[PDB]
Amino acid sequence: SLFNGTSFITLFAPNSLQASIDFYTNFLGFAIRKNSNQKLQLEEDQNNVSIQLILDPEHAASVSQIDQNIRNLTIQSNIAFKSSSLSKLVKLLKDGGHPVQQSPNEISPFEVYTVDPLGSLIGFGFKNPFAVNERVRKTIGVMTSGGDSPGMNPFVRAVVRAGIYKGCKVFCIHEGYEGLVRGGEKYIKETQWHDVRGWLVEGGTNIGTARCKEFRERSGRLKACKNMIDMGIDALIVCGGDGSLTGADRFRSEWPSLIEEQQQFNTHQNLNICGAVGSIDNDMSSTDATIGAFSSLDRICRAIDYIDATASHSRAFIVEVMGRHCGWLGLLAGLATSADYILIPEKPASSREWQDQMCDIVGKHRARGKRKTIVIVAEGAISNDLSPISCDQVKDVLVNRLGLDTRVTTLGHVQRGGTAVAFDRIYATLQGVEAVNAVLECDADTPSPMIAIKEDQITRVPLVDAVELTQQVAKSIESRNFKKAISLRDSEFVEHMKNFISTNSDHVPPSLPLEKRKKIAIINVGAPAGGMNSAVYSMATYCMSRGHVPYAIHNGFSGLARHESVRSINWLDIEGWGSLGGSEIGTNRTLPNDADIGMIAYFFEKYGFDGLILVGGFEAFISLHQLERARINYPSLRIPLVLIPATISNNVPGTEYSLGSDTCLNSFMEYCDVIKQSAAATNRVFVVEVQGGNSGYIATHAQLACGAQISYVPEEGISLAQLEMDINSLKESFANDQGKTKSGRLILKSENASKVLTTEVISTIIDDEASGRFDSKTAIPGHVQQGGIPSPMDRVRASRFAIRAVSFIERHSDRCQTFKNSISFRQTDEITSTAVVLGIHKQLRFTPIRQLYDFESDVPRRMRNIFWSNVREISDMLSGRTSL
Amino acid sequence: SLFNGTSFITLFAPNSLQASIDFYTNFLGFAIRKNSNQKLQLEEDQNNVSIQLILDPEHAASVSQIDQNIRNLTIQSNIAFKSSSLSKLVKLLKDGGHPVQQSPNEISPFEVYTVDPLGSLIGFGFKNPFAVNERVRKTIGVMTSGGDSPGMNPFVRAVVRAGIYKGCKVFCIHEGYEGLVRGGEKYIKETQWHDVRGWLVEGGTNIGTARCKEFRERSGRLKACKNMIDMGIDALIVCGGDGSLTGADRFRSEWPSLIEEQQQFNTHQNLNICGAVGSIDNDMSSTDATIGAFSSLDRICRAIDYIDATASHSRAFIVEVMGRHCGWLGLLAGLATSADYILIPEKPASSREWQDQMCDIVGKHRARGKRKTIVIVAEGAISNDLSPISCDQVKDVLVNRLGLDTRVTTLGHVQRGGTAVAFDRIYATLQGVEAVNAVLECDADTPSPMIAIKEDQITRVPLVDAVELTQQVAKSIESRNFKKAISLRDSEFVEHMKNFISTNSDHVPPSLPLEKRKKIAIINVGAPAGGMNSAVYSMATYCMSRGHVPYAIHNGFSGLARHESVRSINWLDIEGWGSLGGSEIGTNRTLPNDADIGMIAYFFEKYGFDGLILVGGFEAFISLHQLERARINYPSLRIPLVLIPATISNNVPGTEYSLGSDTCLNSFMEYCDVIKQSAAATNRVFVVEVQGGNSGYIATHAQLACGAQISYVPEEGISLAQLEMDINSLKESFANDQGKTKSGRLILKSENASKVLTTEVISTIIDDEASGRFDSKTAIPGHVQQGGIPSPMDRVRASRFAIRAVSFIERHSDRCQTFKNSISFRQTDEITSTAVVLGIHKQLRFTPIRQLYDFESDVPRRMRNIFWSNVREISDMLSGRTSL
Amino acid sequence: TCLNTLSGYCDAVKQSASSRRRTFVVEVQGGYSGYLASYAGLITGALAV
Numbered sequence A, B: 001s002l003f004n005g006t007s008f009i010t011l012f013a014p015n016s017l018q019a020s021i022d023f024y025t026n027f028l029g030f031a032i033r034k035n036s037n038q039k040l041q042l043e044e045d046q047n048n049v050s051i052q053l054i055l056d057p058e059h060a061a062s063v064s065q066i067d068q069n070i071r072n073l074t075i076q077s078n079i080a081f082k083s084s085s086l087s088k089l090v091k092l093l094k095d096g097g098h099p100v101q102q103s104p105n106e107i108s109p110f111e112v113y114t115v116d117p118l119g120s121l122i123g124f125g126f127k128n129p130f131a132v133n134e135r136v137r138k139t140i141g142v143m144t145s146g147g148d149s150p151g152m153n154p155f156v157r158a159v160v161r162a163g164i165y166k167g168c169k170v171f172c173i174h175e176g177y178e179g180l181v182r183g184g185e186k187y188i189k190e191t192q193w194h195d196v197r198g199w200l201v202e203g204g205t206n207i208g209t210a211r212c213k214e215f216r217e218r219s220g221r222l223k224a225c226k227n228m229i230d231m232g233i234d235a236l237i238v239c240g241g242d243g244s245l246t247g248a249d250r251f252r253s254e255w256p257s258l259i260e261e262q263q264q265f266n267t268h269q270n271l272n273i274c275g276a277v278g279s280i281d282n283d284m285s286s287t288d289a290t291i292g293a294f295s296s297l298d299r300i301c302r303a304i305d306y307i308d309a310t311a312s313h314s315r316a317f318i319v320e321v322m323g324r325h326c327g328w329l330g331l332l333a334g335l336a337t338s339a340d341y342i343l344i345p346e347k348p349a350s351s352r353e354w355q356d357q358m359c360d361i362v363g364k365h366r367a368r369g370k371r372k373t374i375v376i377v378a379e380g381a382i383s384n385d386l387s388p389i390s391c392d393q394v395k396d397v398l399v400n401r402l403g404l405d406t407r408v409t410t411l412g413h414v415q416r417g418g419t420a421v422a423f424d425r426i427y428a429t430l431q432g433v434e435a436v437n438a439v440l441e442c443d444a445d446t447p448s449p450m451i452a453i454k455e456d457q458i459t460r461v462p463l464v465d466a467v468e469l470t471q472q473v474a475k476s477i478e479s480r481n482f483k484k485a486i487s488l489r490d491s492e493f494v495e496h497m498k499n500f501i502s503t504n505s506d507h508v509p510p511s512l513p514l515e516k517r518k519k520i521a522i523i524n525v526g527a528p529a530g531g532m533n534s535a536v537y538s539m540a541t542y543c544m545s546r547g548h549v550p551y552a553i554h555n556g557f558s559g560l561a562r563h564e565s566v567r568s569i570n571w572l573d574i575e576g577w578g579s580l581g582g583s584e585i586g587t588n589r590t591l592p593n594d595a596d597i598g599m600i601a602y603f604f605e606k607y608g609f610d611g612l613i614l615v616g617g618f619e620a621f622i623s624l625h626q627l628e629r630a631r632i633n634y635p636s637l638r639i640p641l642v643l644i645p646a647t648i649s650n651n652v653p654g655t656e657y658s659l660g661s662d663t664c665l666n667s668f669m670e671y672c673d674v675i676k677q678s679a680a681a682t683n684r685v686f687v688v689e690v691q692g693g694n695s696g697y698i699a700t701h702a703q704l705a706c707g708a709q710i711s712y713v714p715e716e717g718i719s720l721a722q723l724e725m726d727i728n729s730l731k732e733s734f735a736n737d738q739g740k741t742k743s744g745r746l747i748l749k750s751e752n753a754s755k756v757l758t759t760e761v762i763s764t765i766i767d768d769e770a771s772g773r774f775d776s777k778t779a780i781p782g783h784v785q786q787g788g789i790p791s792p793m794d795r796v797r798a799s800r801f802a803i804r805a806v807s808f809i810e811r812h813s814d815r816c817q818t819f820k821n822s823i824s825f826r827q828t829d830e831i832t833s834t835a836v837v838l839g840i841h842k843q844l845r846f847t848p849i850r851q852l853y854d855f856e857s858d859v860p861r862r863m864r865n866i867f868w869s870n871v872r873e874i875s876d877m878l879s880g881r882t883s884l
Numbered sequence C: 001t002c003l004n005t006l007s008g009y010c011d012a013v014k015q016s017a018s019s020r021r022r023t024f025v026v027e028v029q030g031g032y033s034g035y036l037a038s039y040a041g042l043i044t045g046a047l048a049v
C-alpha cells in the first residue's frame, strides 16, 4: 500500500479553540502536550491517537455556528474512532448537553459534534459483535383487639419472628387490653420462634381478644402502664380495629402518667407504640386494605357464587353481610358478583324511597331478562334519616311489592372464620415485619405510626391522623353528608362506587352525547387468567353505560385474521361472566404478525374501531408492540391500544399486578397447605413444582404465604453448593424438631429454576443425602394452577382496569383521528403515547409500549428486572434460610 | 360505500381478438357465452367473473406490440385475480411460452401478458398464508470361481433369497466349475432361505471354488451342460474373476451342443447366464469396482497404517501386495497411505531404469524431510521389457543404493480373508439381487449380462464386451503400450493415476506458468468427517504441484472473522494427514453470517484469495449460499466457491456420496456385527440407536450390511401400528427359529425416527409384548460413530474431489475477476455458476448452490428428497419385513 | 374425601383445558387396586381409565 496508516486529524479554529480543547479532554480523555510552541492533543502512552489544533483564521465563526444548528435535524464528512463500551460515552455526552446519533440505542456507532462537528465513534472495521469492554435492643409486646379477623395469626407469627431476628424479647399479651390491664405471667407470656409454628394456616387469634371495660377509663389505662414497666416491655404493637387503635392512641397521649407512689421512670419514659389494622370492615381511613378484609370479602363471594350456581322465575335472594361501619364489603361483593341492588351506609337512597329505588333497579334487571335477583344487605344498612334497614324489611318488599319468593342467606361468624386468603397472609406477614422495624426505628420526636397498604405497597402513616380521619367519615354519615362520606373514603372506594353503579346501569339512556360515542373492541391474548372474563364483562357493561358499541374479537388474532371473529356483546349473553374462569371470548398465544397483520388492519377499518383493549400476558404485550409498529403501514391501527396484563406468572412489564395472579396464588396456597399438612402427619419434606414460567413471582409469594423453607426461582437458578447447604439445613431442621410443633416442610421449585436439577431429581438427592433420617417426596400439580372461579380481588381489579382502559380510549381517540385520516404519517411522539400498558407502580399509570419493550423487558425467549427481592429476603428470614 | 363491487373487465381489440380468446380460455378456464350478438368470457356458474372483448378499433396493433416487448425487461396498470395454487398456473404459462413474475417462486402473486398485457393473479386482500388449494418361473444355479474374494457370501445370500422371493428354486453349485462338470446331488444342492443365515459376516466362499481342468476343454464343457439339463437348472449365475467369466462366456457361445446320444432339448434350448465380478484385483474392464476389491484395499491400508504408526533415519518399508494383473490395489493403497514409490504393471519406468526412478523419488522425499519411506510392490510388478520385479530386487536397491534398513511386509492370504467391508456387503448384495432379475428378464435376443457398478450405480453390461475389453488391456501391457493400457482402464483409474503422481510430486518445478498461478483457501465447516484431512492434504499437495499457494482457514468462519486464522500449508507439516481422522485445520458449525460476513470478506481481500474450497456438511452448504448472496456487497467474495460434502449423515443435496459416510458406515457395521453375535449367543433382540440426524441414509445401509430385521428412519417415522406389526414379526421369527441357524436379531432405530418411541421405550414395549418368549435389550453407542482412521475409500474419494475442486477454481477464476474488479455488479448468471457443490449423480458434476438451496433442500430445522428408496425395499425383502 | 378432592381437581383441569392444553392425563394414586381410578373416572367423565 501507500496510505500505510493514520497519523493525526488536523483542526483549524477561528482566531477563541479553548471550548474544543475543554471538550476533547473532558469528554474523550485527551491531553495537551507539554510546552506548546504557540500559546497537540494526544490520548495516552503506547498508542497512536492524535488531534492537531491551530488558531489560524481558516475556519469562520459564522459558517461553523450555522453548520452546528443545521445538524440539529434527527450530511457531512466525518472521522470515526475505535472505542469500547459506547453506551457509557453516549450517556456522558447526552447528560453533558451534547446530542448523539446511534444504531439500535443498544448500541453500534455513536456520533456527536464540537466546534469541529461530526466526531464519530465505532465499537469494532466491518459488521460483527463489537470490541470487548475494557477493565434497637428493646423488648416488644404484641396484642390483638376486637372481633376475629383472618390474618391476625400470620401477623403475630411475623412480629414474634421479626423481633426475635432483630435480637429482642417478644411477649404475647393474651386477651388484648384485658391481659394488658390485668398483667402478669398469666396474660403476658414470653414467645419463642417455634411457638408461632404453622400459624399461617390457623384462623382467628391464638393470643385472643377481650373487651376491657377498665381500659376505657384512666383507672385501667394506668394499671396497664404499670404492667408494661413491670414486665419490662419497652414497646407495644396493637393489631385490631378502629376503637381498638383509637384507645391505643388515647393511651399514647395519656402515657405521661409519672405518678409518684426514679430508675423505672427514667428508663421506661416514652411509649413506643405501633398499630396495624386487624378488621374485616375495611373502615380505617389511612389504609387501602385492613387485615382480614379480603378473606371476609372471599367468604361472602363464596356464598353468592353458590347461590348463582342454580336455575327460575319469582326468585329473589338476600345476602346479609357483616360489617357495621363501612360498605366496602357490600360494594366489593356486589361488584365481584354483579348484584342487582346493594344496601350500604355510604350510598342510601336520596331522591326517592329505598323501596322505590330497589324495586326500580330490581324490576329493570328482571324485565331485561335477569332471573336470579341478588340483594346485598350491609350490617350498617341505613336510610337517609339514619334509620337502620333490616333484612326482614328488605325481604317483605321483595315478597309483597314484587311477587318474589325470597330466601335469606346470612354469613355471621363465617365472615371471620377460616384461614387468611393469600393476600391477607402475604400482607399481614409483611405488616408484622414492618411493625417491628417501625417500633425499633422510633424516636420520641417521631409520631406513633400505623402500618398501612397504599396500592399494593406497605407504608407508615401517623396513627392520630388515621384515627381522626375515620371519625370524620362517621361524622359525615351521622351529619347526613353521604356524598362527602364517599369522597372521604380511600380513592379506590370512590372509584369502585362509580364502577359499580355504571356497570349496574345498558338499561338507562347513555351518559355521553351522540358525537362522543365510539366503537371499542376487546381481545384475549395468551393463556387464560382469572379476570379475563371480568375485564370483558366490565368493559362491555361500561360501554353500554356510556353509549359505546362494545365488540369482542373471538379467539385472539388468529380468529380475527383467518375467520373475521368480530362479535357484538349482548348484556343478557354476558350474564355471570364476571364470576367465570378462563376466557369466554377465546384466547391463544398467536401474535398479530403470526396471524395476518394486514387482515387485522383490514377488519379494524371494516368495523371502524375507535380503540382496542388487550387482556392477556406477554404475548398480548408483544401484540401491542407489533400493532404499534405496523401503524406506519395501516391508518386503521392509529387508534388507542391498551393492555390490561393477565397472566398467572406476572411476567408482563408495566404492572406489579397481573390479572389472575391472586386466583393462581390462592389455589397453589391451598394446595401447599394440604401438602405441608401431609408432611406434618409423617420426618418428611415435599419438593413442590411451581408454575409461572421464567417468572419467579408465584413461588416467591407462595413461599411467604405457606411457610416453605426454600423457594427455587428462575432468576437465581439452583447451584449444587446451595442445594448441598439447603439439604444440610433440612438435616439440622429435623434433628431440632425433637420437642417443637410438627408443622411439616416444603421446598417450592419453579419448573424453570433448573432444567437438570428437576423436582424429581432434587427429591432423590434429598433422600440420598438424608441417610434415612427423613424422606423426600415430590408434589407436581401441573398446569392446572390457573383455577376456575376467579378471586374476588381479580374480579374487582379487572372491573377497575377495564373502565380505566375505556376512559383512556375516550381521552385519546380525538388526537388519533388526525394520524388516522392522514397519510404522510412519520410516526411521532403524540401517536406512540396511545399504544400503552395499564399498570400498578408503587400509582395506577399507563406506560407507552415503546419504553417497556425496548428497555424494561427480556423480549427474547425468556419473556420477562424483578421487584419482589425484599419479599424473598423476608421469607428466607422467617424460615431460617442461609443463601450464598 | 358506492363502488360496491367489480362487475367485469372490458378489453378493446384491433379490428383479428381471437388470439386472446384462445389464451383466456385455455390458460384461465374461461368460456365464450352462447349465441354472440356480434360475430362475453365468463368463468363458471354460481360466480361473478367476466371479461368483455370488443373488436372496435380503440387499441392499435403497433402500440400493443411495442408494449409487449417493452415489458420484456425483468411499470404498467393491471388487474389481479383471486386464484388458489398459483404454482400450477405458473408452470402452465412458462411451458406454454408465456413469461411470468412472482415473489419467492414458492409463490405469492403471479403476473403474465396477452394481447391485453399485465394479467395479475394473487393467492388470497392483505399479507397472510394464502387461500387453500381447491379439490419368470425358472430354477437358478449359483457358483463362485477363482480365488477367495470378500463379499462372495453376501452375494450368494442375495441370489438365494432374491430367487426364492421371485418364486424359483435356487441351487448352489459347490466347488464352482468342478462341481458343475462332476454334477450330482454331491455338488449341486438345493438351498433354502435360512441356509444362507448370517453369511454377510462370513469370509471367503461357503459354496467353495475349484479350478476345473476339464471345463477348459469341450470334454468338460459338454459334461457340465448335461448336468444342468439333468438338474433342471434353467439359468446360471457365475460370481468370479476374469478367466472365470471368460470361460462362462465361451460356454455361452458353445451352448448349442444339441448332441444326439426331444423334450429336454426343446425346454433347455437356451442358456440364461449372468456374471458378477468376484475379484480383489479390480481387473475387469466394464465395472468400476469388483466384489472384494475395497476389502482387499482395506487389508493393505490396515498394514500400511500400522507401519506408519511408529518413529527414525535409514529406514525403508516394502509392502508386497497381492494382485496379479491390475495395479488398482497398488495405486489406491499408494494414494490412501501417501506412499513414496509404487511398482505397478500399468506404470513401469520408461525414460530411465526403475531403480534410478525409485531412488530419485525416494531420495527427494527423504531430502525434504520424510523419514518413513513406504514402497508398494504389486504382484504384477514389472519393468518396460516385461521382466517381473521381485521384492528382494526392490529390497537390495534400498539396502545397497541407499543406506536404508528395509523391512518387507507381505499380506498374502490376509488380502482375501476377513468379512467384506460395508461397500462390498452393500454392493455384493444388490448385485446378487440384480443378477437374479437379469437372469429372469433374459430372452434369447438379449446378450448375456454382467452386473457392473458405474459411479456408485448398479448397471447391466454385455459380458462379451467386458471380456473383450479386459483382453485389450492385457494386450496393451504385453505389446508394451502402458500409456494406452492406462487409458483403456476405467476413467476413475486414469484420474487416480494422475491424482497420485501430482500429489507425490512440491519437490519438482510447478506445472503452471507464473501468470496462471493462484491463491486457493480451504475451510472445514460442520462436525468432523473422515476425509476432511485427506481433502486438505490432496488439495495442498496438488496446489504445490501446480504452483498455487494453498491457505488453510483454521477453525471455520469463527476462526477467520474473530481471529484471522489464515494459515499457510507446509508439505512436511501435513505428513500423514491423509490417514488422520477428524479435522486438523479445525471445524465448527458457525455460519458466515453468525461470524462477521464483513470480516470474512475483509480477510478474503487482505489475503487476495482466488478461490475457496469448503469441506463439510449442511452448515458448509448454508455457508456457500450465505457467501454467494453476500457477493453484491463484497467484491472479495466474487471468486469460485466450491463445496465438497463431508458428513457421516449424507444430508447435503448435490452428491449421493458425502465424505466420511463409508468410514461411519463401516464403524457402525462392525458395532452391529458384535451386537448381533451377542444376540445369537443368548432368544433376544437388540434395538440399536443410529446417528445421521434427520437423514435415514446410515440406518438404511447398516440394515442391508448387517442383516437387521427392521430399520426405523426419520423420513418414515414409527407408527404404533407398524410397531405392533413388527413386534408380532419378532414373535413369529423366534417361534420359527426352532431348527435354523441362530444368527441373532437387530432393529436399527435412527434417533430422529421418533421423539416419543425412543430406543429405550421401543425395547420396553418389545419385552412387554414378548410375554417371556424372548427379550429385548438396547445398544446406544452414541455420537462416537464418526470414527478415527478414515476408510481407504474416503481417503481416495477426498483426493479425487479436492483435485476436481482446485481444477474448477482454475477454470472459473478468469471470469470472476471481471465481477471482482468492477462495481455495478448486478448479480448475473455467469457469476452465480461459480458458487457450486461438487457431487456424484448416477456422473461427477458441479451444481450451482442456487438450484439446490431453493429447490432441492429442507433449508429449515430439518437440514435435508432421498435416493435410497430401492435399497430400503431390498433390505425389507431380505429380512421378511411387512410394511403398511 | 379423596374422590371429592379428585373430582374438584379435575373440574379445574377441564377448565384449564378450554393456547395452553387439550387432553389431560390425571394420575390417580389408589395403590394396586383400580377402585379409586374407576370411581374417579365415572364421576369426572374421563374418556379412558
Ligand SMILES: Nc1ncnc2c1ncn2[C@@H]1O[C@H](COP(=O)(O)OP(=O)(O)OP(=O)(O)O)[C@@H](O)[C@H]1O
Binding pocket: A339, A340, A341, A342, A343, A347, A348, A349, A350, A351, A352, A357, A360, A361, A500, A501, A502, A504, A505, A508
Ligand atoms: N344501591 C344500588 N345498587 C345497585 N345499583 C344502584 C344503586 N343505586 C343506584 N344504582 C344504579 O344507578 C342507577 C340509577 O340509580 P338512581 O336513578 O336511583 O339515581 P341515584 O342518583 O343513584 O339515586 P339517588 O339520587 O336517590 O341517591 C340505577 O338504576 C342502578 O342501575
Ligand SMILES: Nc1ncnc2c1ncn2[C@@H]1O[C@H](COP(=O)(O)OP(=O)(O)OP(=O)(O)O)[C@@H](O)[C@H]1O
Binding pocket: B340, B341, B342, B343, B344, B347, B348, B349, B350, B351, B352, B357, B361, B501, B502, B504, B505, B508
Ligand atoms: N511409480 C511411481 N511411484 C510414485 N511416484 C511416481 C512414480 N512414477 C512417477 N512418479 C512421480 O512422478 C514424478 C515425475 O516422474 P519422472 O521424473 O519419473 O517422470 P515420469 O513421466 O513419471 O517417468 P517415465 O517417463 O520414466 O515413465 C516423480 O518425481 C514422482 O512424483
